[PDB]
Structure formats: C-alpha cells, structure tokens
Structure 1
Amino acid sequence: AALNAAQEKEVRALVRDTLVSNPEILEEAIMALQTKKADEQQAQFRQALASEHDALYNDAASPRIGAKDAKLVLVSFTDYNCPYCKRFDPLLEKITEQYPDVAVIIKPLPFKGESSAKASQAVLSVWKEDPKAFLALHQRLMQKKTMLDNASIEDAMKSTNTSKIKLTDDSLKTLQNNLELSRKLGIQGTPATVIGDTILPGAVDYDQLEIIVKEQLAKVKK
C-alpha cells in the first residue's frame, strides 16, 4: 500500500538486476552472514532465553501440541527424518494433558536434508490455515520410517486432508527463525527441548522427562 503495483514490480526487477550487475554486493553479504553466525555462536546462553522469550514462546507461526493457554510450555526442536526425534515426540505428546497445564511448541529444523526443510515448510504452512490439522500430519511425518521425499510427503499431506494447502514462502521465514534460534541457543543436536531456562539435548526416558516437567511446575507461582 506504500508502493503501487507498477512501482512494486519494478522494484522486484531491480533486485534481480542489481545483484547480477553488481556481484560485489553479494560477497559482502556472504562475509556479513558468516560474521553474524559467529556473533550468535559466541553469545551468552541464559541471556538468550531472556531475550528470545518472545520468539520461543510467543510465535504465532510456531505449531503447538496441547492447550493454547497453559502455564508451562515446552519447545521441541525437531527434524522429521531424525530417528531420535521420532523416538521422543511421542514422549512429548503424552506429557501434554496427562499434565494439562503443559503444552509443547514445535520448532521444525532442516538439518538432515532438503526434505527436512520441505517437511517443515509443509507443517508451518498448515499451522496458519488450520491449526488443528497440523497434528495428524506432524505424527505421520514423524512416524513415517525413512528419509521422506516430495513423493513420500505428498502421501503424508494426503492422509491428513492437507493437500489443498500450498507451501508458502512466508512459512520459510519461520523455519529460518527456528534455525537462527538453534544457533542462538547453541543447539546443533536434535531433538532438543527447552523446558524453562534449560535445554534438553537428546532422547530422555519418559520417567525422567516426567520428573523434569514437574520440577518446572514447582517453579511457577501457586
């Protein structure tokens, strides 16, 4: 609404024209990227959670398994082709409303491949249009053994009534927010679950996960 369609499309042509005509802009943006990675990589961890509370716990684009109004919320960084995530996600859903004032926030990651980014792109695109339709797709993207492809996924989005949903480019923005966050939180292992100022890197026994979520509910008010 700031720019008109005629203005808006000329700008889109200029982006292409400028980067190719002046490639020096690109290498500058490359070194600037490799630098910002280091700025986040060599940061202080706890103060990341105090400064990243709004992106972790208050992202409207981040899928949630459980109640939207809960006192304790877990954040699970996951990959749909990672065997350990497939082994832990069920443990994360069972704690949801066996312990009802606890919910789980999903942060999909593109670590193990292109399908990981692709599967994430599907899951995030679904979350905005029909949030309740997320779960069925989420479980089968997880419970499907082997590295999914666009073909394996076209079967998955179809066993969940989510095939009319288009993978948006804006859903890719969120996947990135999750990716920068893993670095800011210093996570290069998945699964990773944030449960209140602390991170859980790896698969943990249910009865231990059980104790942890209870200890963090003691950490809250009355």
Structure 2
Amino acid sequence: ALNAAQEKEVRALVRDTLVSNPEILEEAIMALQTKKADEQQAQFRQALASEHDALYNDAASPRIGAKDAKLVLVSFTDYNCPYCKRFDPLLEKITEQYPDVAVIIKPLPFKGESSAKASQAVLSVWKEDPKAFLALHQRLMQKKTMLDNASIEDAMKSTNTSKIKLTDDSLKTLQNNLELSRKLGIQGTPATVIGDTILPGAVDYDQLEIIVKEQLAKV
C-alpha cells in the first residue's frame, strides 16, 4: 500500500496534472490514435431513437448517395477538421461501393467562423441546387488551409455555386445540427451514426466497411 493520505493526494494530482497540461491529454489521444480499435458507443440509443426525425427526415440535411437507400449513415463533420477532411472520402467510397447505403451530412461550426460559413454555404447550396452540393462539399474538404471567406468564395466559384446566396434558414439548420450533436454526446468530429451506435472518430476503410455490412445485414 501507501499512506491513506498519500493515496488521496495522488488522486488530486491526477486531476491537477491533466487539466493544467492538456498536451498530456492530446498525446494520450495521439497514443490512442495508434491503437486500431473502433470505439463504438451504444450509450445513446434512446437519444438516437428520440431524434430519429432530426437525423434522417430533415430535408435541409445534405445527402450523399441514394434517397432510395436501405441504410443511412449520419456524418457529423467540420470542413476545417483535418481528420474530417480525410475520413470523408471513406464515407463517400462506402456509398459508391454500396449503393444501398447513403450518408447524411451534418456540418458543425466547432473550429470557428469559417466552419460556420462553410456549413452555411453547403447547406444553402443543397437547398437551392441539391446536385451541385457534392462538388462544393468535396472542394471544401480538399482545402489544406484554414478556410476564410475568400477561400470559400473560391471553392464556390470553381464548383459553380458562387451565385447561391447563404441563407438565414441554413443557420437554423446548423443550430439544429449543433443541438442534435449535443444530445448524442458528440463533442468531436468526425462522428458517424451507424444504426444504434456512434463512431466517435475516424476509422480505417476496413473497419468502416465491416460496420456498414453488419448493419446493412440487420435490414
């Protein structure tokens, strides 16, 4: 053992050490990144059921894939999130390889104004010209640099959506995405809803393919 008083001082040092040096946390996160484990969460079934219509029946939420689809994934993502930029082509590839599968995008504004603006832009484009959304979506994901208004205008120009107005209705959609994320325990991106579980972060295509196939099976 060790002094019953020393025990409680170690417990406090665990708290003070982590909160004061978040690089410790971020390195621990880096360490967890090297472990190939899907960290699927089932803590939120009730909340997912309770929010079914907000997840899957919101016409303002862009869709990649078939409206006909048998399985719909919900991607909570941020156009400025580096892991998001890399995880999205995997999600896209699922819909290409499994046409029975579609992905609903829920953009989030976590990394600031330009995230909010990009979110606004794609949501607006989706509402006015659904078929032009995917190109703009991809173009934003390809930006290697922190977005700003200039680089968003460029993305819209090179994807012929520059003439589409960013609307106020789209911001209501964005605030829904946010409150919805709040309720599903989603505090980081990318988070992916696949049936009853949430995939709290990005995974390898191999792991994603298996998870889709298992849920695509259940229906």
TM-score, normalised to structure 1's length? 0.79
Instruction: Quote how far apart the aligned CAs of 1:181 are.
Output: 0.5
CA offset digits 1:128-171 (Å, max 9, x no partner): 11101000000010011111100011100001100111100010
CA offset digits 1:159-217 (Å, max 9, x no partner): 11001111000100000110001110000010000000100011100011010000001
CA offset digits 1:12-47 (Å, max 9, x no partner): 999999999999999999999999999999997221
Structure 2 unaligned residues grouped into runs of 5+: none
Aligned counterparts of 1:6 and 1:126: Cα–Cα separation in 2:
61
Residues 90 and 175 of structure 1, relative CA distance in 2, 3 Å threshold: same
Residues 37 and 175 of structure 1, relative CA distance in 2, 3 Å threshold: farther
Instruction: Quote how far apart the aligned CAs of 1:66 are.
Output: 0.4
The aligned residue for residue 39 of structure 1 is 38
Where in structure 1 do 4 or more consecutive aligned residues deviate above 3 Å?
2-44
Aligned counterparts of 1:13 and 1:119: Cα–Cα separation in 2:
42
Percent identity between the two aligned chains: 100
Instruction: Quote how far apart the aligned CAs of 1:218 are.
Output: 1.2
Q: Is the 8 A contact 2:41 2:198 kept in 1?
A: no
SS in 1 for 2:74: strand
Q: Is the 8 A contact 1:43 1:184 kept in 2?
A: no
Residues 106 and 13 of structure 1, relative CA distance in 2, 3 Å threshold: farther
Q: Which moved more, 1:35-44 or 1:114-123?
A: 35-44
Relative CO higher for 1 or 2, CA cutoff 8 Å, sep ≥ 6? 2
Q: Is the 8 A contact 1:40 1:184 kept in 2?
A: no
Structure 1 unaligned residues grouped into runs of 5+: none
Aligned counterparts of 1:65 and 1:17: Cα–Cα separation in 2:
44
Aligned residue pair count: 219
Aligned counterparts of 2:88 and 2:22: Cα–Cα separation in 1:
44
Instruction: Quote how far apart the aligned CAs of 1:11 are.
Output: 60
Instruction: Quote how far apart the aligned CAs of 1:114 are.
Output: 0.5
SS in 1 for 2:157: coil
Q: Is the 8 A contact 1:41 1:186 kept in 2?
A: no
